[PDB]
Amino acid sequence: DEKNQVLTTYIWYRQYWTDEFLQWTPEDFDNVTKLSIPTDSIWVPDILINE
Amino acid sequence: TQPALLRLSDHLLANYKKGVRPVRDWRKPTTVSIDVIMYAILNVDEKNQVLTTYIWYRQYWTDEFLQWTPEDFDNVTKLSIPTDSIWVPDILINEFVDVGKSPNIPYVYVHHRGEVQNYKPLQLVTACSLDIYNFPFDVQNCSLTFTSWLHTIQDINITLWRSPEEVRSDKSIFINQGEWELLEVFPQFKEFSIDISNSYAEMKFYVIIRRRPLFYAVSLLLPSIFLMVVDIVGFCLPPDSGERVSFKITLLLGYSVFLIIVSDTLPATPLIGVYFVVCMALLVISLAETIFI
Amino acid sequence: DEKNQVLTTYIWYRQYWTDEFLQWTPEDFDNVTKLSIPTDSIWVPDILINEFVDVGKSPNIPYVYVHHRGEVQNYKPLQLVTACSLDIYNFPFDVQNCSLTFTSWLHTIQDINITLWRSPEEVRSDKSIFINQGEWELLEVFPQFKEFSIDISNSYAEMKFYVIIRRRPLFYAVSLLLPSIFLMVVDIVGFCLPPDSGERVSFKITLLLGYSVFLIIVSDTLPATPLIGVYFVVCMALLVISLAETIFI
Amino acid sequence: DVQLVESGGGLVQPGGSLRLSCAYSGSLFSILRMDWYRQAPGKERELVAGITRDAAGYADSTNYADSVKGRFTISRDSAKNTVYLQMNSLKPEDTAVYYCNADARTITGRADYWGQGTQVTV
Amino acid sequence: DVQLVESGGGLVQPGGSLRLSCAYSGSLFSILRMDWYRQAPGKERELVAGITRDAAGYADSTNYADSVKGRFTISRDSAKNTVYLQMNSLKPEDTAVYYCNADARTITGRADYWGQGTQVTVSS
Ligand SMILES: *[C@@H]1O[C@H](CO)[C@@H](O[C@@H]2O[C@H](CO)[C@@H](O[C@@H]3O[C@H](CO)[C@@H](O)[C@H](O)[C@@H]3O)[C@H](O)[C@H]2NC(C)=O)[C@H](O)[C@H]1NC(C)=O
Ligand SMILES: *[C@@H]1O[C@H](CO)[C@@H](O[C@@H]2O[C@H](CO)[C@@H](O[C@@H]3O[C@H](CO)[C@@H](O)[C@H](O)[C@@H]3O)[C@H](O)[C@H]2NC(C)=O)[C@H](O)[C@H]1NC(C)=O
Ligand SMILES: *[C@@H]1O[C@H](CO)[C@@H](O[C@@H]2O[C@H](CO)[C@@H](O)[C@H](O)[C@H]2NC(C)=O)[C@H](O)[C@H]1NC(C)=O
Ligand SMILES: *[C@@H]1O[C@H](CO)[C@@H](O[C@@H]2O[C@H](CO)[C@@H](O)[C@H](O)[C@H]2NC(C)=O)[C@H](O)[C@H]1NC(C)=O
Ligand SMILES: *[C@@H]1O[C@H](CO)[C@@H](O[C@@H]2O[C@H](CO)[C@@H](O)[C@H](O)[C@H]2NC(C)=O)[C@H](O)[C@H]1NC(C)=O
Ligand SMILES: *[C@@H]1O[C@H](CO)[C@@H](O[C@@H]2O[C@H](CO)[C@@H](O)[C@H](O)[C@H]2NC(C)=O)[C@H](O)[C@H]1NC(C)=O
Ligand SMILES: *[C@@H]1O[C@H](CO)[C@@H](O)[C@H](O)[C@H]1NC(C)=O
Ligand SMILES: [Cl-]
């Protein structure tokens, strides 16, 4: 929008961080490596865009 | 006891954690058979290159935790339970450029062998690269890539609930008499990986739609031939009158404002503009003829 | 929306069913008959409309009335954005027939079944709490029950509502016929100009131009053949042969 | 996946009537088409009657063989989960073992299923 | 971060076949490229085979050395988390210690990783 000076785009976004509480050993858990858990069940960073 | 199916609903959902993927063996992937029915093409945006459609969508998967035996439950086969009370796959579409407002279905059918039946309509605002080369008679080919946005193929895998030919030929419950005519919806499975050790499941749906060259017929060819025959009437005017020149000029002006008005219909070269600028040049050489004689 | 073929309406909707768990005896409860309880605290049927192509913004009703025999009374207004195949053949005087198919989107007929709270004639003739003085005139809302199945062993209950609406041919009257007859009588005045003057030719040309830009402007009112265009292109051709007459003489 | 059970077969004198029942059962399934077949000893499998919902998704559509055209009438009850075959004025040529073939779609996929069949001797 | 383990190495007579396996493991990682290397006694490290997904994000793309061009076939199994090297019609020159090099991206960053390697001896 040249008049109002505003750009509308679509982005594919990726977030990677370390949850020190969600750490475990693969053994005695039947050698599981990763686990899928609900987003809103864990701590999430508040990173946003200023523009 | 005898509260009937109320027992069942408890028995299954008592300790059922909807966060963990429903498999007794975590190595076993959950296969989701999906189904897509094209209900209507709501709007095509040629300028922004984005297709908006309405789909009837079906999800079928197996919940290994929601399994039971029909007996000692008064021979119950299937049970209706709240969608958001059980684990649900995160299958979405890559072509999504927006979020369409679609009715939320609260219940699903879970059967005694653990089969989960999930029906839901979706409004799809998906980006599609359009080619308007042959404007009045153009066919369009749009992709709908269903895939889990996170889970790998060893966690969630997608198949087709019914035969791909059935999915293709399905024109039932679709609204015609519109600007577009649905030809086919061609499903195709693909395993997409951006690297080794991580592979994801893709289920593509090629929706192919053909335009109806009727609304754009009259609005295009009729005024051109009209001003054409009016110009033909204009030739009958004797060169001596002098009003013949003003005739050709005013007519040229009218066709000019006409082509400026019709310029706001479909953006692009549209190729049909050539078969139009021909008429433009024809009126030009007509005028040149008039001023010559 | 004639172009996209989609109807947007506002409905006052009533749902009545029986909750066998919410039954009690009026006595030893201080002779209470009915009780108001939160909608989202009890089981609710998933009845929707098949013609839905979108979601209309409608006020949320938080409470329902549950009576001692287990009758649940649920009132709620709905904004319905439903797709409807429209026929604009006779544009100024056209009747439209739109379907509203209420059915459970999941449950079979052996789980959830739909009936009519009151007589179908009452539903049909009900024109109360409806706003006239608009572009459309409501004729009737005809209810009809049907058992829809796509296969054996699975049958679903459908309750169709055919809303029939008739257009008001007044706003499209003046905006169409008045300028045509106006330019027509102006052309008639134009004939009175003597062929010798020469201004008669410019007269006919300018008038033809005015009617051309007129028909181009009025071309953006209702999309389609509209059939009313024929009774218009007649006038167009009439001005054309008028011009041909002028240049002839 | 889906199991079919035939019943009603027996011995009847010519010109009599008999109603056969075929009960389907399972977890998640969709019967698209249900056909009745009969097989006389030594003779091939013969198509008797079939039933499938019409183009319009309301009323059904039956399909009969030229042999049993007027005598036989196939029906169904979705509520009792049973498809019926009403055999009237039975001829000695109607004597055979009657199976029922259900073309059903499950989570596994679309497939044909057969019952154990019942003996009909005229 | 990501550990590689070679296996399958042994003693085989010339003209025989042998399949080498390389198992990667860790927490969060993405193997972009996996190469097979072999080192004969005294000789340098030699590239045998590699594999990486094509420009199109579906089918993979293999890369073989001129030596083992026709004999060897590199494959992979993402499910078993193991990349394979199928050695056919083994020559005595194929005798060496076979390591595996994985170019992987972890939370730490993109880096190269090596295994302990296995001994492959071809003799009569
Ligand atoms: C995730 O699901 C897909 C889709 O089912 C799986 O791909 C499928 O793999 C089977 C292998 O048994 C293919 O079956 C084969 O069918 C073809 C005829 O189409 C024929 O060559 C054989 O007779 C065989 O039965 C199946 O076709 C194929 N699906 C498609 C669409 O081609 C995939 O394997 C699944 N992933 C995992 C990790 O299980
Ligand atoms: C789901 O609800 C519908 C609507 O009530 C049920 O259809 C109705 O079935 C009853 C019982 O057969 C019909 O009553 C009958 O009416 C005829 C005259 O039409 C009369 O001669 C009979 O003696 C009997 O009273 C009723 O008409 C019919 N509704 C309509 C609109 O035709 C349907 O049976 C229900 N489904 C289930 C599984 O209960
Ligand atoms: C988990 O993985 C470990 C190692 O990958 C497995 O332990 C190996 O396999 C058997 C033990 O059953 C031994 O012969 C090996 O020597 C073990 N190797 C090591 C390095 O420990 C273990 O069995 C796996 N467990 C499960 C449940 O999958
Ligand atoms: C629309 O485009 C897709 C490609 O994006 C076409 O898909 C091809 O389909 C044929 C069979 O119909 C396959 O043999 C090809 O492998 C497919 N190509 C790809 C890249 O997957 C599709 O045919 C096109 N539709 C029309 C009507 O032309
Ligand atoms: C609840 O209603 C009953 C019935 O209307 C009331 O009982 C009646 O009123 C008094 C008893 O309080 C008697 O004189 C009548 O004969 C009773 N009639 C019957 C049919 O029992 C009762 O009082 C009401 N209770 C409350 C708390 O409102
Ligand atoms: C609007 O269309 C519906 C069908 O879409 C018409 O419904 C018919 O109603 C008559 C009786 O009024 C029945 O005999 C027919 O069987 C119905 N047709 C169908 C397909 O169910 C309805 O009459 C139409 N309304 C108007 C005013 O014409
Ligand atoms: C349940 O079904 C079985 C087998 O069809 C039957 O034997 C049993 O009597 C049935 N019980 C009830 C309560 O319907
Ligand atoms: Cl198991």
C93 Cβ neighbours under 8 A, 6+ residues apart: C166, C167, C169
Return d(Cα C1, Cα B277) in angstroms, integer.
33
Q: Touching C: which chains, 3+ CB pairs < 8 A?
A: B, D
Nearest-5° Cα angle at B54, B50 to B56: 140
B196 touching E (Cβ < 8 Å): yes
Listed resolution, Å: 3.5
What architecture is the B1-212 domain classified under in CATH?
A: Distorted Sandwich (2.70)
User: Domain E1-124 sits in which CATH superfamily?
Assistant: Immunoglobulins (2.60.40.10)
Helix (H, G, I), strand (E, B) or coil at C200: helix
Which ligand does the CA of B190 lie closest to? Answer: 1
Strand partners of residue E63 = E50
Q: Please indicate whether residue A31, judged by its CB atom, sits closer than 6 Å to ligand 3.
A: yes
End-to-end CA gap in chain D: 33
Phi, psi of D12 (to 5 degrees): -140, 145
CA B277, B282, B288: angle at the middle one, nearest 5? 125
Q: Which amino acid is at B76?
A: V
Distance CA B25, CA E63 (A): 36
**Which residues does residue D50 pair with via DSSP β-bridges, in sequence order?**
D35, D63
Residues in chain A followed by a break, C to N above 2.5 angstroms: none
Q: Is D110 on the interface with B (CB under 8 A)?
A: yes
Q: How far is the CA of B187 from the centre of ligand 4 (A)?
A: 10
Q: Which amino acid is at C46?
A: D
Evaluate whether D41 touches D119 at the Cβ level (below 8 Å): no
Q: Give me the torsion for CA of C190, C195, C196, C202, rounded to 10°.
A: 50
Closest CA in chain B for residue A29:
B26
Residues from chain B that touch D103, judged by Cβ atoms under 8 A, are none
Q: Side by side, which strands form the sheet with C47-49?
A: C47-49, C95-104, C156-167, C136-148
Q: Which residues contact ligand 2 via a Cβ below 6 A?
A: C 109, 113, 115, 145, 157
CB contact under 8 A, E107 and A33: no
Strand partners, B54: B40, B123
CATH 2.60.40.10 assigned to D1-122? yes
Q: How many CB atoms lie within 10 A of CB D117?
A: 20
Q: Which helix (H) or strand (E) holds E30?
A: strand E29-39
Report angle CA E87, E88, E91 to the nearest 5 degrees.
90
Residue B92 CB contacts under 8 Å (≥ 6 apart), including other chains: B146, B147, B148, B149
The Cα A20–Cα B147 span in angstroms is 30
Q: Give kind and range of the element (H or E) at residue C183.
A: helix C171-191
Neighbours of C177 (CB within 10 A): 15
Method of elucidation: X-ray
**Token digits of residue D86:** 């009403």
Backbone angles phi, psi at C42, to 5 degrees: -135, 160
Residue nearest to atom 2 of ligand 7 (CA): B75
Helix (H, G, I), strand (E, B) or coil at C123: helix
Residue type (1 letter), C150: I
Is E71 in a helix, a strand, or coil?
coil
Neighbours of B116 (CB within 10 A): 26
> Does the beta carbon of B168 sit less than 6 angstroms from any atom of ligand 4?
no
Whether the CB of A16 is below 8 Å from some CB of chain E: the reply is yes
Distance C33 CA to ligand 5 centre (A): 14
Nearest to C49 by CA among C78, C20, C86, C16: C78
CA B247 to chain A, closest CA, distance in angstroms equals: 41
What per-residue string of b and e applies to E75-108 under the rule 16 or more CB within 10 Å gives b? ebebeebbbbbebeebeeebbbbbbbbbbbbbee
* DSSP at C15: E
Neighbouring residues of B6: CB distance < 8 A, sequence distance ≥ 6 = none
Give the sheet arrangement for strand E3-7, strand by strand.
E3-7, E18-25, E82-87, E72-77
Beta strands in chain C (DSSP E): 6-18, 34-38, 47-49, 63-67, 71-83, 95-104, 136-148, 156-167
Are the C-beta atoms of residues C64 and C109 closer than 8 Å to each other? no
Asked whether the beta carbons of residue A34 and residue E107 sit closer than 8 angstroms, the reply is no
Closest ligand to C-alpha of residue C163 is 6
Is residue D41 within 8 Å of C115, Cβ to Cβ? no
Cα angle for residues B236, B242, B246 (degrees, 5° grid): 85
Ligand nearest to the CA of E58: 4
Q: Which two tokens stand for residue B192?
A: 């997409």
Cβ of B159 closer than 6 Å to ligand 4, yes or no, is: no
Contacts of B41 (CB under 8 A, 6+ apart): B51, B52, B53, B178, B179, B180, B182, B209
Question: Cα separation of D57 and B171, whole Å?
Answer: 14
Q: Does D28 touch chain B (CB under 8 A)?
A: yes
Task: Answer whether B33 sits within 8 Å of D105, measured CB to CB.
Answer: no
Q: Show the tokens assigned to B134.
A: 């042959």
CATH topology of domain C1-168: Acetylcholine Binding Protein; Chain: A, (2.70.170)
